[PDB]
Design a binder for this molecule. Structure first.
Ligand SMILES: Nc1ncnc2c1ncn2[C@@H]1O[C@H](COP(=O)(O)OP(=O)(O)OP(=O)(O)O)[C@@H](O)[C@H]1O
Ligand SMILES: [Mg+2]
Lengths: 60, 49, 112, 52, 406
């Protein structure tokens, strides 16, 4: 969980193709970048997550 | 071609993530904090129980 | 008799300071574990800030030249653990046990 | 490990820098109104008598 | 009551190697130009690096300081004028001046310096503090043993409560000049022709030990032997800084030979590996009995100078002296000098007293420690009572310095 600071997709050549979705999360303790599975892009737009939005992501 | 490209890409990704971790390590070797808020400096008293 | 050459003889209206025997003396700005006076103005203790809400590690409040109150910081090998430390694996477990027993003085800011 | 640290000038060459207090740390824009609402008091280069 | 007050005072630290000057409150001297100045037969004076490094006919290289004390007051006035006009860019009568002085400065020289500063420069206030006291203050220590190894002398000065214990001062002639002489002798033994960089028009890369393939500058004017010697001393000091290293323990030929060599390239393109000879030279500071100069001499090693200086003080203060050893001076920057000194002192210090060397092994903290302490002292609000005012110099006369400045 944390405040979203970036939602930059990671473009790549397929062996536009994305291989990861980097989400930056900020908390009062600090900031962390997560190399999430690309499929999470559907849920991000479904939830309308934007920079400066507080979110939480369950591991499972 | 897919069989060869998949392995070549997996290696490229391993290399790219290692370079990213190295860049993060370099960024963390740099000083993290140099300033703190005015409220913490004067508007509060530090206590311990 | 053996002491006689340098024997101690109290005199009326006099007071004396006992010599250091158990531990060699040290400067006031040094820990009592190192024979120092351990003067509290030079002591560095774990400190937590309000922004960011993270423990910065060992720190001491010092007034600067223009009256600006500065937080000096001391390096420690466990600095990463102190960064992770808040709200009270082997080294982390020992540190947590020491803090929960309040063996370490860890300051937190509060409004007056 | 050490419970507390003692030093005069600084503890070690690897010591982290001291944290100086400052406003505008979170950006100038957020503190624009606070800084703009006031005006600084005048400072002078003036002679002073030292009774010592 | 509050933080120390800054009254815009100046801090001057005129050493035999470089003249350090600046404004009080700063953490570093704003200027440090070589003390040696060019003189043309008052005589025309060339003082700063920009003027010293260009050849001139019938220009001699001289220094106002002798044995750590000013001898030629004309060159001293010239250096002060140059410092003011070029670097300070402020009127002397507007800023108080705090100057350092040698621990062994004479009364008459102090009086003459005070007279000069007040009559000639018309300064508003003056103060004269010892280099050892300023070095101790720069480290936040009110007491301790200062160990200064400059260009002229290696001196240990015991300081207690901010006062120099003059009876405990022990001085040795082994200093930067001795190391320069040793390097000169080594180059002479190796038949290395010291070509100053001003004589080199162009140079070509050559193999190790190969004869130098360099072109001499044309239309070069005749230069005095003093200026040529000064340039040679400059290149030798560069060699000292770049190559020389103090052995971590008592010098051994086998251990020195086993360690890797260091390669140095001279200005004329000549290059060679200095092998173990780079280690033998700094050992003379620690074991002078082995120096080719005079084996039977009475000079004392730096560690012996340290132990002797403390031994002359009250035993009640020796715990403070050993508990705070402050190393200063440019000659102490030689590699591993601090480590070797610490080892030798720990071996020679009594186990009943704690020995601690302050970790100040950096060029700025070692060379400018006196200036740093002077800036600190001049910036203290409590120090504003110590200033010698012009009115005080008028009423108490030239002798007033004897009582106001301890
Ligand atoms: N990094 C270095 N390595 C070796 N020697 C050095 C280094 N830096 C400076 N020196 C030498 O230090 C010597 C003394 O310089 P320093 O600035 O300490 O003298 P000073 O205090 O002005 O003079 P003095 O005490 O002789 O009156 C010089 O001869 C210089 O060549
Ligand atoms: Mg010196």
């Amino acid at each position: 969980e944390g405040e979203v600071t970036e939602l930059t997709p990671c473009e790549t050549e397929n062996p536009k193709t994305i291989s990861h979705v980097i989400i930056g999360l900020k908390t009062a303790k600090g900031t962390k970048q997560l190399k999430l599975d690309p499929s999470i892009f559907e849920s991000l737009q479904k939830e309308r997550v934007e920079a400066g939005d507080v979110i939480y992501i369950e591991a499972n | 071609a897919v069989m060869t490209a998949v392995r070549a890409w997996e290696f490229w990704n391993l290399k790219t993530l290692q370079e990213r971790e190295a860049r993060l390590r370099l960024e963390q070797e740099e000083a993290e904090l140099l300033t703190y808020t005015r409220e913490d400096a004067y508007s509060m008293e530090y206590v311990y129980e | 008799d053996p002491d006689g050459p340098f024997a101690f003889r109290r005199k009326a209206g006099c007071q004396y300071y006992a010599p250091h025997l158990d531990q060699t003396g040290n400067w006031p700005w040094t820990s009592p574990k190192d024979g120092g006076l351990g003067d509290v103005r030079y002591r560095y203790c774990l400190t937590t800030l309000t922004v960011p809400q993270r423990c910065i590690g060992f720190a001491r409040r010092r007034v600067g030249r223009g009256g600006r109150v500065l937080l000096d910081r001391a390096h420690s090998d466990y600095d990463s653990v102190f960064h992770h430390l808040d709200l009270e694996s082997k080294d982390l477990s020992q540190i947590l046990v020491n803090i929960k027993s309040c063996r370490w003085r860890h300051f937190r800011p509060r409004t007056p | 490990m050490h419970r507390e640290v003692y030093a005069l000038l600084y503890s070690d060459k690897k010591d982290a820098p001291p944290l100086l207090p400052s406003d505008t740390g979170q950006g100038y824009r957020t503190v624009k109104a606070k800084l703009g609402s006031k005006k600084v008091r005048p400072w002078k280069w003036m002679p002073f008598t030292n009774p010592a | 009551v509050y933080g120390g007050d800054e009254v815009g005072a100046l801090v001057f630290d005129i050493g035999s190697y470089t003249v350090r000057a600046g404004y009080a409150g700063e953490d570093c001297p704003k200027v440090d130009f070589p003390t040696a100045i060019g003189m043309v037969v008052g005589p025309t004076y060339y003082i700063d690096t920009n003027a010293l490094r260009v050849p001139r006919e019938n220009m001699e290289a001289i220094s106002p300081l002798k044995n750590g004390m000013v001898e030629d007051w004309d060159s001293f006035q010239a250096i002060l004028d140059h410092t003011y006009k070029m670097h300070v860019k402020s009127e002397a009568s507007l800023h108080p001046v705090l100057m350092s002085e040698a621990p062994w400065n004479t009364r008459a020289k102090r009086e003459k310096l005070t007279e000069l500063m007040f009559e000639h420069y018309n300064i508003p206030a003056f103060f004269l503090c010892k280099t050892a006291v300023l070095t101790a203050f720069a480290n936040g220590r009110s007491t301790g043993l200062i160990l200064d190894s400059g260009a002229t002398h290696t001196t240990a000065i015991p300081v207690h409560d901010g006062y120099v214990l003059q009876q405990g001062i022990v001085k040795s002639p082994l200093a930067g000049d001795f190391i320069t002489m040793q390097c000169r002798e080594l180059f002479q033994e190796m038949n290395i022709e010291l070509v100053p960089p001003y004589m080199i028009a162009s140079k070509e890369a050559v193999r190790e030990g190969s004869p130098a393939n360099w072109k001499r500058k044309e239309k070069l004017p005749q230069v005095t032997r003093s200026w040529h010697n000064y340039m040679c001393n400059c290149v030798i000091q560069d060699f000292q800084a770049s190559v020389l290293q103090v052995s971590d323990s008592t010098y051994d030929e086998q251990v020195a030979a086993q360690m890797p060599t260091v390669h140095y390239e001279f200005p004329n393109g000549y290059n060679c590996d200095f092998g173990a000879e780079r280690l033998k030279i700094p050992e003379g500071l620690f074991d002078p009995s082995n120096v080719k100069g005079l084996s039977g001499n009475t000079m004392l090693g730096v560690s012996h100078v340290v132990t002797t200086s403390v031994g002359m003080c009250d035993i009640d203060i020796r715990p403070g002296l050993y508990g705070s050893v402050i190393v200063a001076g440019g000659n102490t920057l030689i590699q591993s000098f601090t480590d070797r000194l610490n080892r030798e002192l720990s071996q020679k210090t009594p186990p009943s007293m704690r020995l601690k060397l302050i970790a100040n092994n950096t060029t700025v903290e070692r060379r400018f420690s006196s200036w740093i302490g002077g800036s600190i002292l001049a910036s203290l609000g409590t120090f504003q009572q110590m200033w010698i005012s012009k009115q005080e110099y008028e009423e108490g006369g030239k002798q007033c310095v004897e009582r106001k400045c301890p």
